[PDB]
Amino acid sequence: YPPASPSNLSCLMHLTTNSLVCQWEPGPETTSFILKSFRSRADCQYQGDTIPDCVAKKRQNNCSIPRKNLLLYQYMAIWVQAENMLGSSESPKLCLDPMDVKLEPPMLQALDIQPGCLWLSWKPWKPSEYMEQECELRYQPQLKGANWTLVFHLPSSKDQFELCGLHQAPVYTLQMRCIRSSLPGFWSPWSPGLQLRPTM
């Protein structure tokens, strides 16, 4: 029957596959979905070139525009179209610069060589090494009382960094996360817990 307008269309630039991956909510099952876009300028008012249509696979509620078909530090209008024999629905268009939309946590580790002290080092997630990031380090003694303490505004990579004052437990957990420095972007997920024993 007539397809309902798809919703909650989101898009993320996957550096791994080097492609803008979009996904929508197909809505009340009743068809085919075609992620359609067009090159444009800001606010997506400019009706630029037609980015070749990406037709979603069978039971996949997402598509994926290869970077060969995208201008990069420029805006574009995206929308999904649901088409049934009884009509076609179409989602609201999004206006994004693909470079504005997915970071993976930085590589935190122990500095490979004082009491209550930990030496550390980290390097950014390589595929985003080009991006200037600002990170957050959070740590805590692995005690029954969960309380995280942070360190803000750290670089995306540190040669060596001595975290100190760590005497409140034999072991501490540390995680780190980064975000694009001064331009739009979301935080990366926190890096995996890192149990480390402060120099006891």
Binding site: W148, T149, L150, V151, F152, H153, G165
Partner: protein, 161 residues
């Protein structure tokens, strides 16, 4: 690398500027209405009335470790919030001005508290007369201003490491 979010420090600096104008508005009112314009003159009344002052000794220190400075800032602001309440609005003509100033100050304290909570960092004088309330008003406004002028520096320093 700081234990405080740069936005927190910025919102704090914006609150100091805002309170500094409120107090300025108050000190203009008291000098236009009651010709009480030079707190200097009221120096001794500071002891006579019992105007508690506020230290920030822990502030010209700290860095990645700064709960001490955050606790002084809060308690200092918390104190002036109390003294201003003690003035019982001073008078009808100054009531609104003083009220603006005390809400602002109170919320600035609350705000520093809740942030300490988040980050894990975890009585009043008498002023028994029109004049005492007016004089106490002029002294507390000026002690608040000194406190804030010192805090502005502590914060600017924290925000620019």
């Amino acid at each position: 690398a700081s234990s405080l979010p740069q936005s927190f420090l910025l919102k704090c600096l914006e609150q100091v500027r805002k309170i500094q104008g409120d107090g300025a508005a108050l000190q203009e009112k008291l000098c236009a209405t009651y010709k009480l314009c030079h707190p200097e003159e009221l120096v001794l009344l500071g002891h006579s009335l019992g105007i508690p002052w506020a230290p920030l000794s822990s502030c010209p220190s700290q860095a990645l470790q700064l709960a001490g400075c955050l606790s002084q800032l809060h308690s200092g602001l918390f104190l002036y919030q109390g003294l201003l309440q003690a003035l019982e609005g001073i008078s009808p003509e100054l009531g609104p001005t003083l009220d603006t100033l005390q809400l602002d100050v109170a919320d600035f304290a609350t705000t520093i508290w809740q942030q300490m909570e988040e980050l894990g960092m975890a009585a009043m004088p008498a002023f028994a007369s029109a004049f005492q309330r007016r004089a106490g008003g002029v002294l507390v406004a000026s002690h608040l201003q000194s406190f804030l002028e010192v805090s502005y520096r502590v914060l600017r320093h924290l925000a620019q490491p």
